[PDB]
Design a protein around this ligand. Sequence first.
Ligand SMILES: *[C@@H]1O[C@H](CO)[C@@H](O[C@@H]2O[C@H](CO)[C@@H](O[C@@H]3O[C@H](CO[C@H]4O[C@H](CO[C@H]5O[C@H](CO)[C@@H](O)[C@H](O)[C@@H]5O)[C@@H](O)[C@H](O[C@H]5O[C@H](CO)[C@@H](O)[C@H](O)[C@@H]5O)[C@@H]4O)[C@@H](O)[C@H](O[C@H]4O[C@H](CO)[C@@H](O)[C@H](O)[C@@H]4O[C@H]4O[C@H](CO)[C@@H](O)[C@H](O)[C@@H]4O)[C@@H]3O)[C@H](O)[C@H]2NC(C)=O)[C@H](O)[C@H]1NC(C)=O
Ligand SMILES: *[C@@H]1O[C@H](CO)[C@@H](O[C@@H]2O[C@H](CO)[C@@H](O)[C@H](O)[C@H]2NC(C)=O)[C@H](O)[C@H]1NC(C)=O
Lengths: 50, 429, 79, 51, 49
Amino acid sequence: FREAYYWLRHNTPEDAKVMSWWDYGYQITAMANRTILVDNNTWNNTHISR
Amino acid sequence: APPLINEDVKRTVDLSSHLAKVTAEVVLAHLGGGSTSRATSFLLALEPELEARLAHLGVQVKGEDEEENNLEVRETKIKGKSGRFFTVKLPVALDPGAKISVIVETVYTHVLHPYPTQITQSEKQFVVFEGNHYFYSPYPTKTQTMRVKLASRNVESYTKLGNPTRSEDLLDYGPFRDVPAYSQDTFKVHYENNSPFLTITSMTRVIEVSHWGNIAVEENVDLKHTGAVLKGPFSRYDYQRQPDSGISSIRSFKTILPAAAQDVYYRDEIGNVSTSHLLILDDSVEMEIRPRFPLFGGWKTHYIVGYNLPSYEYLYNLGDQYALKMRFVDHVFDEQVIDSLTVKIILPEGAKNIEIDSPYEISRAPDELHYTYLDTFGRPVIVAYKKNLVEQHIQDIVVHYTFNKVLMLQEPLLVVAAFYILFFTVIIY
Amino acid sequence: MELEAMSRYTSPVNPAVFPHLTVVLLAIGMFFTAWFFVYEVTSTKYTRDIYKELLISLVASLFMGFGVLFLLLWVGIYV
Amino acid sequence: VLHFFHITIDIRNVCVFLAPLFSSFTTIVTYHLTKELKDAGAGLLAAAMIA
Amino acid sequence: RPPGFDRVRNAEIGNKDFELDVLEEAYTTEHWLVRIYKVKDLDNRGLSR
Ligand SMILES: *[C@@H]1O[C@H](CO)[C@@H](O[C@@H]2O[C@H](CO)[C@@H](O[C@@H]3O[C@H](CO[C@H]4O[C@H](CO[C@H]5O[C@H](CO)[C@@H](O)[C@H](O)[C@@H]5O)[C@@H](O)[C@H](O[C@H]5O[C@H](CO)[C@@H](O)[C@H](O)[C@@H]5O)[C@@H]4O)[C@@H](O)[C@H](O[C@H]4O[C@H](CO)[C@@H](O)[C@H](O)[C@@H]4O[C@H]4O[C@H](CO)[C@@H](O)[C@H](O)[C@@H]4O)[C@@H]3O)[C@H](O)[C@H]2NC(C)=O)[C@H](O)[C@H]1NC(C)=O
Ligand SMILES: *[C@@H]1O[C@H](CO)[C@@H](O[C@@H]2O[C@H](CO)[C@@H](O)[C@H](O)[C@H]2NC(C)=O)[C@H](O)[C@H]1NC(C)=O
């Protein structure tokens, strides 16, 4: 889990957007330091459904 | 000035790895007659193309006493002539009609360029090297030869000036004769090179010495793979299944730590790393470090390693005077290249008369003041910088300072007061 | 004034000593500290004497405070 | 506060160990609340169970 | 068990061979726990992908 995050951290453009299920939104942002589309708080249902 | 000539030159060029080592054995001779003064020193010249990339230069006389045969070399500028020059002081003056044999060693960095720039997982790695056929010197050379050692025998192309013989992975050039001084001919070779192209972009070395019998060192390492850039997707399945896959890729490297190193820890910004294997040899503590993911061209990683050492191994004292000897930098790996190294030494608070006997030139920044556990006055910090360091620069440095015994007893007193005041507050309440 | 010419230094307290000192010093500090609190809570306006309280508090602080330092070194957080 | 006294601790350590410390504080609160309802003897039992 | 078996579902995958037209494999972990794919760009020649 950490190994993938570290790989993204240094091997991808800083402005890259990563798509994943909402479960992992917090972990990716904290360690990968890359933008995410969905997050655990799930404040927008329509965004998650899309 | 006395007229000197290069009676014989033999050049060996090593291109096996990402660094180009050059050794030239020159039998210097004095051409001047009795009227000319005895020559105590001789000049060395750098080609303009490679002068920027010269990591290190060493000269030693050809003799059994190699330890004592090393000659002092100083950077000098000769008027009217472009390029860097070095002045070498001979052990004994060279009188007219005499000759001496000296060995010159130079190391250049970044001189091998991947061609093609981009390769896929299956494709191999090829590099281009550009040198000189002739020994570039202020003095004429009577005759010279070159021997070039390639990383692999699969040499794609090379310059055939002088009908060089090619056997196995070795090339022979010359013998050239009557070469004028300052002569240049561009030697170009393109060949397969699969050696690990690892560059340490920056490293920070922090040394903390504590009066309680312990010194702790932590090194922050930033590593980048400077080989041909990977092209196309990375197949995990292919990489595991086939040995040949990603042959250029680097899997692991080994660091030779100090013999006394204790409590060695390997970690990263995001937590610990459990892949490193530690082996304790009698002479040194071998550490095998494996990065979290294999490094292909253009990839990078960061890691931090630290360890503790006993005081008596490296610390020395004479009453109030304390002098500590430390190796300047760790042996991270063979053929290591460091673009920027910063060394910080944190002495105990209250140190006075701090002096540093640098082995060689290093920029020194103003000393900082550091606060850590129990510090009120503050611990003095020594700061230094250098660039383009290579393996040859693993020398020894000594620092001298004065300290007093009473200061150690100060440490308990501060701690006791905080507890006592709490009792007093209860009484008042 | 060079390393070979000069001597070498080590902490006077050897590493093996540290575990024993930390345990002994802390235990003495704890006993006095408990005595101080129990005496204060039980005591009343007419039963308390400043002189007794100061002596117990000072002794407790000294023993425990040194003990804490040995604990930090034993843990390995060298000052 | 810890940095103010020159005790340099990582922020990460503070968060990791924040939770165990409060559990001890909760134990003290439990004893007093139980003592109010019935007696001290009940409160000591409650503190042991909650811990 | 035969190749292509999925241990956690205890079943063998029906569809074993297929290719990704719009996605490419960027990185996969040693145990395959996390798989990363990169989004392919549009077609240079405008052909329907
Ligand atoms: C936080 O991160 C840190 C850092 O990662 C974690 O600590 C680290 O944890 C790892 C866990 O593996 C420890 O690894 C240990 O490494 C040493 C060194 O390994 C190298 O040298 C070995 C020496 O072998 C010599 O002799 C043989 C012939 O006998 C020769 O072939 C060799 O060349 C040497 O001369 C060597 O055996 C190792 O080879 C192995 O690995 C390489 C690839 O690395 C392979 O090619 C080899 O085939 C082989 O697999 C290697 O070169 C090892 O000695 C340790 O092995 C012991 O412990 C293993 C478990 O960790 C266990 O599997 C082994 O069998 C062995 O078992 C030991 O203990 C047993 C009792 O429990 C005994 O029965 C047994 O005899 C033996 O004593 C081990 O792999 C790191 O040392 C450690 N690093 C540090 C700095 O502490 C930390 O845990 C992390 N914290 C977390 C996650 O919370
Ligand atoms: C996480 O990513 C952010 C986003 O870029 C990084 O912020 C950059 O930080 C560097 C170094 O201070 C600045 O030069 C850039 O201008 C910053 N960019 C932006 C867009 O703010 C941040 O450094 C990363 N976090 C780390 C490395 O811990």
